[PDB]
Design a protein around this ligand. Structure first.
Ligand SMILES: *[C@@H]1O[C@H](CO)[C@@H](O)[C@H](O)[C@H]1NC(C)=O
Ligand SMILES: *[C@@H]1O[C@H](CO)[C@@H](O)[C@H](O)[C@H]1NC(C)=O
Ligand SMILES: *[C@@H]1O[C@H](CO)[C@@H](O)[C@H](O)[C@H]1NC(C)=O
Ligand SMILES: *[C@@H]1O[C@H](CO)[C@@H](O)[C@H](O)[C@H]1NC(C)=O
Ligand SMILES: N[C@@H](CCC(=O)O)C(=O)O
Ligand SMILES: N[C@@H](CCC(=O)O)C(=O)O
Ligand SMILES: [Cl-]
Ligand SMILES: [Cl-]
Ligand code: NA
Ligand code: NA
Lengths: 438, 438
């Protein structure tokens, strides 16, 4: 229903799982605090900074037309019609998160030559430029995540494993790639399970029971969406079932996956893409207020849900400074996707509009084929808001993908349950066995 | 670039793979004589009959707007925008052939609530009405075909087999369903191979080689697209490899698959949806003439290919479709039935919305797609044109057809090679050891 509109000379599209998947009839569910709100706000932060930047499109304002995917490819695609209907023109799209969402959206935007930059979609299917010719991403393909996951097993001599894959382009392509890597290291698969789009608590229990039918396969490798990783952990908890979980970025370092199921989750090894916190973001975010942030139509809902109050009194009294703030793992890539589009446009403007700083005729409208092929693919700049002791640059390969760098974690009970970095993967596995309590 | 347009009070969209997929350079390849031209002609034959049927839309003429998918979902989608650009009006769409084409097209037509009836897409994925809520088919899902294939292996006691699947929604979903059915019948897979969308002749040879590495498994189960089955057989020929093929409807009883590779194909068991010849279609098709077939934009191109002639060279008139042999394409019955299904739906809607006239009343200008699909398309029940007994045209709760398959064996007699109907599957396997020569 709602849309976040911000005005400008060039309008950037945006797609975020602001809401979780709806019920059996509802299309949209509850607010996604981390991968929704924080991620969307990060696009707003980035845009704000680009529009105050004398070196980045100094005479061209970048607007936004941001949509909620509701963590659902079908909802996202009905919403995405807004990007293509003027065929107010959309110059390029930032998103989405889920691969199923970015794939559906890419099939649509290529028809209208609209460049797309995802900040979290890691499915390897997206590397195919015969199919997704207008898509690029600031994250790498799962090509590399799979290989890392297999090297992790091979390191601890975990040679008889089970797999759980969410149905679709992320889960299915993720685990297949994992299996080929595992075979090559003499790792055999006991059983392979799939998780449907619509599964009951009972259905999930049946998956856990299916994994328990192979008592020798204590290690379970997941290439699952967050919600499926959550639901599977919750079923393990309800059945006092014990597995050593090795999981992909879907689960990653999210506290909402493990909440309520800490016991079942304890001892898990998870992977998240390597990133850094961006100070200026935490300041921007924690300073948001429901009276000052009206441009975000989903902020009021988040505020009510976070503080368990209603404006319809004293809800306004709360502060995001008063509460603990943990920055989402992929915030970096959100900010980098927007800057990649902004630098692409600025470079296009430098080549096409030399006599002015305003949008010339050559950019009324912007040719998407030229934009993607000649400028988006060719950006190369220092990551903005990166810490002074870090040397990250934003660029894409020939196929529009980012560079394969991951962090590796363990979920342990310290007596709070926390995520602990125990290593990394960067064209080879590195891990400190001292940090893992087994 | 071309489109078949016919005038009517109501315009039915069409989607056929008139061309094969392009090469490394091109988008479209050579003409598809059987599953392209013949299937398309069957829609035209069907529209003509309905347009002179005194008991089926006697006052509403059905026109057409037929498109070439080029055996490729990206191309098909670029073409399918023609169907949705009204927001001339397209009432419903007939097609496509390939599952990947039908799925993508459905992902678009649902957004504009356009009913779609496929005559050949068998992917079990298309049974999901939470995703493909405007899709129906005159064919059953591959859930039944995979069961039939597994049952054949079981009967002949073929415990150790290999699998070859095509990349996509047909190959991948179908072979995963056979894999389920093989497990449950104590049948084990030696190796699972996958064929890509753009493989080469040397790459096809490597799949054959990968299969040969496991010499205990001489039986290869295929869930492949015709072009892949053709290419894979050619490589088995070239490398003098010997396998017992068990193929799905993709191969079916197509002579183009086995042409020039007959030796490598001997003994092969194939599945194909049970269908009957339509003599009137045969006569009609054989009567077609480069000079009387102006309404089909691709027919002059089909003639030059089929008869290796050229209209510029004035050497095409010499040939006839009457002087050459005529094998009806196995799924012609489902093309006709799909067209009629939509006609009956529109007729039934007319009875309800225009009671005082045979002409299109205002209550059906425009036709409401939601109502057409939900209240009329899913509810049709009529005897299939061309025995009025109890073999009818109707859709199940998931908008699918009835699981009836003929089983064939490729053999030689009195070179010369043929497909021999050695059995069937219609709620259980019913083959015959007498007709199989081994
Ligand atoms: C895995 O096995 C090798 C070889 O037997 C051994 O050297 C290594 O220490 C083992 N790794 C772990 C983490 O147990
Ligand atoms: C949970 O499982 C472990 C291992 O089988 C067992 O020692 C423990 O008592 C179980 N607890 C319950 C309540 O089932
Ligand atoms: C399969 O094996 C069973 C049991 O050994 C046997 O009765 C049956 O005839 C065999 N089928 C064929 C086709 O040889
Ligand atoms: C093909 O292989 C068979 C069995 O080894 C053999 O009889 C036949 O002569 C071979 N043909 C060629 C051309 O190598
Ligand atoms: N990388 C996951 C998305 C997980 C995330 O949103 O961070 C995917 O490709 O669907
Ligand atoms: N069953 C195949 C179509 C093959 C045919 O067109 O005959 C599919 O779903 O892609
Ligand atoms: Cl998303
Ligand atoms: Cl098609
Ligand atoms: Na600026
Ligand atoms: Na009629």
């Amino acid at each position: 229903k709602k849309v976040l509109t911000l005005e400008g000379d060039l309008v950037l599209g945006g797609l975020f799982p602001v809401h979780q998947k709806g019920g059996p009839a509802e299309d949209c569910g509850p607010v996604n605090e981390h991968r929704g709100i924080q991620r969307l706000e990060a696009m707003l932060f980035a845009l704000d900074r680009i529009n105050r930047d004398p070196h980045l499109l100094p005479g061209v304002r970048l607007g936004a037309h941001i949509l909620d995917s509701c963590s659902k490819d079908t909802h996202a695609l009905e919403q995405a019609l807004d990007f293509v209907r003027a065929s107010t023109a959309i110059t390029g799209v930032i998103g989405g998160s889920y691969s199923d969402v970015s794939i559906q959206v890419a099939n649509l935007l290529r028809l209208f030559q609209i460049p797309q930059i995802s900040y979290a979609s890691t499915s390897a299917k997206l590397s195919d430029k015969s199919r997704y010719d207008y898509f690029a991403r600031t994250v790498p393909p799962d090509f590399f995540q799979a290989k890392a996951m297999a090297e992790i097993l091979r390191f601890f001599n975990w040679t008889y494993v089970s797999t759980v894959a969410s149905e679709g382009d992320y889960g299915e392509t993720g685990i297949e790639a994992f299996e080929l890597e595992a075979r090559a290291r003499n790792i055999s698969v006991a059983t392979s399970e799939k998780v449907g789009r619509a599964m009951s608590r009972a259905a999930f229990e049946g998956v856990v029971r299916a994994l328990l039918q192979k008592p020798s396969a204590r290690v379970a490798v997941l290439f699952t969406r967050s919600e499926d990783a959550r639901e599977l952990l919750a079923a393990s908890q309800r059945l006092n079932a014990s597995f050593t979980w090795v999981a992909s970025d879907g689960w990653g370092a999210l506290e909402e996956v493990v909440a309520g199921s800490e016991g079942a989750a304890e001892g898990a090894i998870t992977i998240e893409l390597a990133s850094y916190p961006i100070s200026d973001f935490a300041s921007y975010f924690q300073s948001l207020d429901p009276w000052n942030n009206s441009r975000n139509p989903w902020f009021r809902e988040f505020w009510e849900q976070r503080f368990r109050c209603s404006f319809r009194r004293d809800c306004a009294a709360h502060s995001l400074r008063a509460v603990p703030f943990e920055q989402e793992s992929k915030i970096m890539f959100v900010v980098n996707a927007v800057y990649a589009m902004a630098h692409a446009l600025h470079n296009m403007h430098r080549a096409l509009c030399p006599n002015t700083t305003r949008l010339c005729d050559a950019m009324r409208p912007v040719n998407g084929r030229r934009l993607y092929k000649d400028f988006v693919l060719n950006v190369k700049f220092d990551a903005p808001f990166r810490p002074a002791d870090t040397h990250n640059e934003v660029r894409f390969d020939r196929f529009g993908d980012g560079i394969g760098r991951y962090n590796i974690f363990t979920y342990l009970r310290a007596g709070r349950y926390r995520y602990q970095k125990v290593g990394y993967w960067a064209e080879g596995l590195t891990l400190d066995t001292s940090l893992i309590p087994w």
